Design an enzyme around this catalytic site. Structure first.
Site, mmCIF file in Angstrom:
data_model
loop_
_atom_site.group_PDB
_atom_site.id
_atom_site.type_symbol
_atom_site.label_atom_id
_atom_site.label_comp_id
_atom_site.label_asym_id
_atom_site.label_seq_id
_atom_site.Cartn_x
_atom_site.Cartn_y
_atom_site.Cartn_z
ATOM 1 N N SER A 1 -7.409 -8.513 5.929
ATOM 2 C CA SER A 1 -6.460 -8.250 4.854
ATOM 3 C C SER A 1 -5.057 -8.354 5.447
ATOM 4 C CB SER A 1 -6.659 -6.885 4.157
ATOM 5 O OG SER A 1 -6.549 -5.775 5.058
ATOM 6 N N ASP A 2 -4.125 -8.989 4.724
ATOM 7 C CA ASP A 2 -2.727 -8.621 4.903
ATOM 8 C C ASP A 2 -2.574 -7.105 4.702
ATOM 9 O OD1 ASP A 2 -0.034 -8.912 5.469
ATOM 10 O OD2 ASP A 2 0.194 -10.733 4.262
ATOM 11 N N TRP A 3 -1.441 -6.580 5.146
ATOM 12 C CA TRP A 3 -1.246 -5.148 5.219
ATOM 13 C C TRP A 3 -0.905 -4.658 3.812
ATOM 14 C CZ3 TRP A 3 -3.023 -7.002 9.252
ATOM 15 C CH2 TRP A 3 -3.109 -6.338 10.476
ATOM 16 N N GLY B 1 -2.976 -5.975 1.349
ATOM 17 C CA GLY B 1 -3.431 -7.095 0.537
ATOM 18 C C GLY B 1 -4.807 -6.809 -0.085
#
Ligand SMILES: *[C@@H]1O[C@H](CO)[C@@H](O[C@@H]2O[C@H](CO)[C@@H](O[C@@H]3O[C@H](CO)[C@@H](O)[C@H](O[C@H]4O[C@H](CO)[C@@H](O)[C@H](O)[C@@H]4O[C@H]4O[C@H](CO)[C@@H](O)[C@H](O)[C@@H]4O)[C@@H]3O)[C@H](O)[C@H]2NC(C)=O)[C@H](O)[C@H]1NC(C)=O
Ligand SMILES: CC(=O)O[C@@]12CO[C@@H]1C[C@H](O)[C@@]1(C)C(=O)[C@H](O)C3=C(C)[C@@H](OC(=O)[C@H](O)[C@@H](NC(=O)c4ccccc4)c4ccccc4)C[C@@](O)([C@@H](OC(=O)c4ccccc4)[C@H]21)C3(C)C
Ligand SMILES: *[C@@H]1O[C@H](CO)[C@@H](O[C@@H]2O[C@H](CO)[C@@H](O[C@H]3O[C@H](CO)[C@@H](O)[C@H](O)[C@@H]3O)[C@H](O)[C@H]2NC(C)=O)[C@H](O)[C@H]1NC(C)=O
Ligand SMILES: *[C@@H]1O[C@H](CO)[C@@H](O[C@@H]2O[C@H](CO)[C@@H](O)[C@H](O)[C@H]2NC(C)=O)[C@H](O)[C@H]1NC(C)=O
Ligand SMILES: OC[C@H]1O[C@@H](O[C@@H]2[C@H](O)[C@@H](O)O[C@H](CO)[C@H]2O)[C@@H](O)[C@@H](O)[C@@H]1O
Ligand SMILES: *[C@@H]1O[C@H](CO)[C@@H](O)[C@H](O)[C@H]1NC(C)=O
Ligand SMILES: *[C@@H]1O[C@H](CO)[C@@H](O)[C@H](O)[C@H]1NC(C)=O
Ligand SMILES: *[C@@H]1O[C@H](CO)[C@@H](O)[C@H](O)[C@H]1NC(C)=O
Ligand SMILES: *[C@@H]1O[C@H](CO)[C@@H](O)[C@H](O)[C@H]1NC(C)=O
Ligand SMILES: *[C@@H]1O[C@H](CO)[C@@H](O)[C@H](O)[C@H]1NC(C)=O
Ligand SMILES: OC[C@H]1O[C@H](O)[C@@H](O)[C@@H](O)[C@@H]1O
Ligand SMILES: OC[C@H]1O[C@H](O)[C@@H](O)[C@@H](O)[C@@H]1O
Ligand SMILES: OC[C@H]1O[C@H](O)[C@@H](O)[C@@H](O)[C@@H]1O
Ligand SMILES: OC[C@H]1O[C@H](O)[C@@H](O)[C@@H](O)[C@@H]1O
Ligand SMILES: OC[C@H]1O[C@H](O)[C@@H](O)[C@@H](O)[C@@H]1O
Ligand SMILES: OC[C@H]1O[C@H](O)[C@@H](O)[C@@H](O)[C@@H]1O
Ligand SMILES: O=C[C@H](O)[C@@H](O)[C@H](O)CO
Lengths: 401, 355
Positions: free
Chosen positions: B252-254, B256
């Site tokens: 995941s993006d932070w 996301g």
């Protein structure tokens, strides 16, 4: 450059200089970098910039005795060259610390992790006006307050036209070293860093007295009056700078002719040689100055005797030493001592010794006859003192003609 | 819909896959959720250890010009800058150099490089500089070489951002700070992309990234056709994990990751940052994933594939028998993280002149 490196004077050093190879270096003060408007922004006389302008490294003073610069070798750029050689990092806050948004935050964050923090201070002055006190230029008081808050290894470097007030911090144990470097011209930064990093030990000494307070100097130094005919009376007489300080019994911060090295010198074997005399034959033009002992052949500037001493590098490092000679001429209301010789030995190896020599001319030991209107050599007991400063004189002798 | 194809190790990771499967096979449900979700530490993200099998925390660290928030390193030129060299040798050496600095600072996973998200639909993209060219071909080439450089240096890459992540405006990462929640306020911009365009333009650089051996991919903040990238089954399970045959982990993006179960079902393998950042950026797995497994909602084997994908990189780049050194800098920052920093100088002769 070599002038800068020979001049820069070490006033304090609790152990931090010379630098070995610090990995994290912090720099404070617009004095560390360029005039934001350009080195010559202030114009033909270096006096046209705004009063609050960040003028950068103070390389010359204001007025008719200033000159344009082809470039300035900023302390920061020179400190950076050296950091890069050591594979280190270096960061400078060079804005006005009081007026620039985030300046204070930046310093607070930058300094605690630095192995050493340089603070560059300046004090501009000029032709046309006198300094109103010993006040640091721009934000220097602030810089210093912040610096000692967040770092225990502050090295202060001052570019100034004269004595400044550093009473607040000079005895702060966090200020580990203090140097003044005067007005070093264009080669400002590359004259200084060699000294800091210990390529060459500092060899310069104060050409005036650094008093703890403006109140310790000759009274009425500047007279302010609206009076149509303003009046300064030199009622102190011959007693200016260290003569005044000496006669009044006033301890200054840093005495005339003071300046540390990275090594110590032990003085020895004082010698006055009455046979070492010679006639003044070299000087270009001659005065018509009258004196007692005149006999139609001789001169006021004949060297009547000559005095010798020995310095020994008793330290741990090579270093140069400016040897001073002072004389107490006897008489009434006569200075406690007057400088009548100096001899700078260059780069004296550890353990090595060198002889210091001082030609004393006739005039060097004479008084003015107010009554008879001539120079004459007084009678009495002349003290001769030799040493490192106007108050570090481990060798005295007496002479009586 | 689009089911989750199991990892098999592909071409180069065959032996690493098999060590990964072996290790995962031994793991309890708690251990599975420990490694698939971020914990607290000095790096941008940190995977929980499997401490009973001696698997340690993995340091995930920004960013695509080199390790971010460290002292003792060099500041390399941006992707934008190498692109302009049009020099494959430089593109590789840049990454290789970034790579040694990441390894020697102690990073297991580099949150780099940027391999076509954003690619450059808008010349105003605030972070467009982190990528390379506004061109799939050239971006693919630089991405290939950027990935190879970092991996040759012994650091797992997380190529980013998958996919169609073409504006910063209203990316609207998941954050539940104060009382307020982004989920109440506004959903992420939805990139709505036909199938030709996805294939011929946006996937092209990521295909190159996969071929170069990127160990992981980071799913982006935007939604694609009104589904979050990090829980888009078509995008992760079908396009990436099936057609591009991607054998590694999706990070995941932070913020996301917006949910627990769709994410677990539709392609995500790592929850970041998890317990990091005060949990403010969502914390949808960890204890929640343990519960979902133990109550039959989510298959344990579904989560074992995630953990396998994570460990594959560990073993392939030899971090097991040649561990990176300790990471020593607090890159999060107080008061979010109150930890002291060490010091390590990682700058090597040659780097300054490469830059
Ligand atoms: C975002 O939304 C956009 C816009 O809607 C999506 O773009 C659509 O994407 C789908 C694919 O996911 C695509 O589907 C096709 O349309 C074709 C006709 O235009 C169909 O022919 C094609 O079907 C075949 O593929 C299916 C999937 O494998 C098979 O199940 C199906 O049986 C068909 O395949 C057989 O027949 C062919 C020969 O004809 C043979 O070659 C095959 O191997 C097989 O035997 C697709 O269903 C839409 O056309 C796309 N629409 C547009 C406008 O682009 C996009 O996918 C979305 N993105 C995300 C991330 O969700
Ligand atoms: C007044 C004065 O000191 O002038 C001189 C010109 O030769 C003088 C000697 C001096 O060394 C010289 C060259 C300097 O180099 C000084 O540093 C210098 C100064 C001290 C400065 O002086 C002043 O500012 C004057 O006090 C000032 N005088 C007054 O305004 C004044 C008015 C009433 C009573 C008393 C004073 C002034 C400012 C600007 C232009 C002309 C005069 C002018 C001057 O421009 C510079 O002066 C000029 O350039 C100049 C003077 C008069 C007419 C035109 C030009 C200055 C500089 C370069 C800034
Ligand atoms: C940067 O350099 C500037 C010179 O170019 C300097 O400005 C000058 O500063 C002096 C003070 O040292 C001012 O002096 C005068 O101040 C008032 C004038 O109204 C008088 O009361 C005083 O008697 C005195 O003459 C100059 O006015 C000033 N010059 C100008 C044009 O403003 C800056 O101070 C330097 N910057 C720093 C931070 O030191
Ligand atoms: C789940 O992950 C966390 C995060 O790392 C684990 O705890 C750490 O374990 C390491 C050794 O691997 C210790 O050095 C640390 O002291 C632990 N940190 C904390 C915050 O206590 C935890 O052990 C993992 N649990 C299991 C079951 O493997
Ligand atoms: O904190 C980011 C800065 O954003 C500036 O503005 C942007 C524009 O208004 C526009 O492009 O939208 C984005 C968000 O999608 C804005 O970030 C401005 O608001 C500054 O206050 C901020 O410094
Ligand atoms: C000296 O610096 C330290 C930080 O290194 C600070 O805590 C302390 O207050 C300072 N002390 C003085 C006397 O300024
Ligand atoms: C100083 O000068 C003034 C002006 O003439 C004079 O009145 C005063 O007495 C002087 N004082 C001295 C010389 O000490
Ligand atoms: C399983 O656990 C999750 C999270 O703890 C919960 O949301 C879900 O409703 C549970 N389902 C059942 C059937 O207990
Ligand atoms: C059985 O189906 C339900 C959804 O209907 C799902 O929650 C469960 O995990 C499934 N079991 C399998 C196939 O693992
Ligand atoms: C870190 O310290 C600050 C101030 O000392 C404190 O308010 C904050 O809660 C701490 N951060 C964490 C995550 O504990
Ligand atoms: O020196 C002789 C004599 O000269 C004159 C005055 O200045 C006196 O004060 C001084 O005593
Ligand atoms: O103070 C005495 C002194 O003052 C007057 C001078 O012109 C001298 O000739 C004289 O001797
Ligand atoms: O008063 C006469 C005049 O000449 C005589 C000197 O001793 C001086 O003290 C004084 O200035
Ligand atoms: O000594 C007194 C003094 O008075 C006056 C002058 O004529 C001097 O030459 C003379 O020396
Ligand atoms: O020229 C010396 C000068 O000194 C003074 C006075 O003593 C005068 O007598 C004489 O004119
Ligand atoms: O290097 C791993 C290190 O992290 C954890 C600590 O509690 C130590 O016990 C251990 O050695
Ligand atoms: C923040 C960014 O979205 C992300 O790319 C980083 O990798 C996480 O710090």
């Amino acid at each position: 450059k070599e002038i800068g490196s020979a001049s820069v004077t070490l006033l304090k050093n609790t152990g931090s200089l010379p630098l070995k190879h610090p990995q994290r270096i912090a720099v404070l003060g617009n004095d560390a970098t360029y005039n934001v408007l350009g080195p010559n922004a202030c114009g033909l006389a270096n006096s046209a910039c705004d009063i609050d302008n960040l003028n950068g490294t103070l390389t010359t003073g204001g007025g008719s005795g200033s000159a344009l610069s082809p470039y300035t070798i900023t302390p920061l750029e020179a400190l950076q060259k050296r950091a890069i050689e050591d594979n280190a990092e270096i960061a400078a806050v060079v804005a006005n610390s009081n007026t620039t948004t985030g300046a204070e935050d930046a310093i607070a964050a930058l300094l605690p992790d630095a192995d050493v923090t340089f603070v560059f201070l300046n004090r501009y002055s000029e032709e046309g006006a006198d300094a109103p006190d010993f006040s640091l230029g721009g934000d220097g008081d602030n810089l210093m307050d912040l610096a000692v808050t967040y770092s225990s290894n502050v090295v202060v470097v001052i570019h100034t036209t004269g004595v400044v007030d550093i009473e607040k911090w000079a005895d702060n144990p966090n200020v580990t070293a203090i140097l003044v470097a005067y007005l070093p011209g264009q080669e400002a930064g590359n004259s200084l860093v060699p000294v800091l990093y210990g390529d060459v030990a500092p060899s310069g000494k104060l050409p005036w007295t650094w008093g703890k307070s403006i109140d310790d100097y000759v009274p009425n130094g500047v007279v302010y009056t609206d009076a149509y005919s303003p009046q300064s009376n030199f009622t102190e007489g011959v007693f200016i700078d260290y003569r005044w300080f000496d006669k009044m019994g006033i301890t200054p911060r840093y005495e005339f002719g003071f300046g540390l090295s990275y090594t110590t010198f032990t003085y020895s074997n004082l010698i006055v040689d009455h046979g070492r005399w010679a006639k003044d034959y070299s000087s270009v033009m001659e005065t018509a100055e009258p004196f007692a002992e005149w006999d139609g052949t001789n001169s006021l500037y004949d060297v009547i005797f000559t005095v010798f001493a020995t310095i020994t590098n008793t330290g741990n490092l090579t270093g140069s030493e400016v040897a001073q000679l002072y004389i107490s001429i006897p008489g009434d209301n006569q200075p406690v001592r007057q400088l009548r010789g100096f001899d700078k030995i260059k780069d004296l190896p550890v353990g090595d010794s060198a002889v210091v020599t001082f030609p004393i001319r006739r005039k060097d030991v004479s008084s003015w006859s107010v009554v008879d209107q001539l120079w004459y050599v007084p009678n009495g007991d002349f003290l001769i003192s030799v040493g490192g400063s106007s108050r570090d004189l481990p060798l005295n002798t007496t002479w009586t003609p | 819909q689009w089911p989750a194809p199991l990892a098999n190790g592909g071409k180069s990771w065959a032996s690493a896959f098999k060590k990964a499967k072996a290790t995962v096979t031994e793991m309890t449900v708690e251990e599975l959720a420990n490694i698939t979700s971020g914990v607290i530490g000095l790096c941008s993200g940190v995977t929980g250890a499997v401490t009973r099998l001696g698997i340690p925390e993995f340091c995930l660290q920004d960013g695509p010009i080199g390790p971010r928030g460290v002292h003792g390193s060099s500041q390399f030129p941006a992707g934008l800058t190498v692109a302009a060299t049009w020099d494959r040798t430089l593109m590789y050496a840049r990454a290789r150099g970034m790579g040694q600095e990441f390894h020697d600072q102690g990073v297991h996973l580099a949150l780099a490089p940027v391999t076509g998200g954003p690619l450059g639909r808008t010349p105003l993209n605030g972070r467009g500089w982190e990528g390379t060219f506004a061109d799939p071909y050239a971006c693919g080439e630089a991405s290939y070489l950027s990935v190879k450089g970092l991996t040759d240096a012994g650091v797992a890459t997380v190529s980013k951002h998958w996919i169609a992540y073409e504006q910063e405006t209203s990316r609207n990462l998941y954050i539940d700070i104060d009382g307020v929640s982004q989920a109440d306020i506004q959903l992420p911009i939805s990139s709505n992309v036909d199938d030709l365009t996805m294939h011929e333009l946006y996937m092209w650089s990521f295909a190159e990234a996969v071929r170069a051996g990127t160990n992981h991919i980071m799913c982006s903040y935007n939604r694609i056709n009104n589904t979050h990238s990090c829980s888009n089954a078509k995008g992760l399970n079908q396009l990436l994990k099936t057609e591009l045959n991607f054998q590694g982990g999706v990070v995941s993006d932070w913020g996301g990751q917006w949910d627990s179960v769709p994410a677990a079902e539709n392609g995500l393998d790592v929850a970041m940052p998890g317990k990091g950042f005060l949990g403010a950026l969502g914390d949808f797995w960890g204890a929640t994933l343990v519960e979902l497994i133990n109550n039959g909602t989510v298959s344990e084997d579904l989560v074992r594939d995630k953990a396998v994908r994570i460990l594959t990189g560990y073993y392939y780049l030899g971090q097991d028998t040649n561990p990176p050194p300790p990471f020593v800098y607090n890159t999060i920052g107080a008061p979010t993280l109150n930890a002291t920093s060490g010091y390590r100088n990682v700058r090597k002769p040659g780097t300054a002149e490469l830059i």
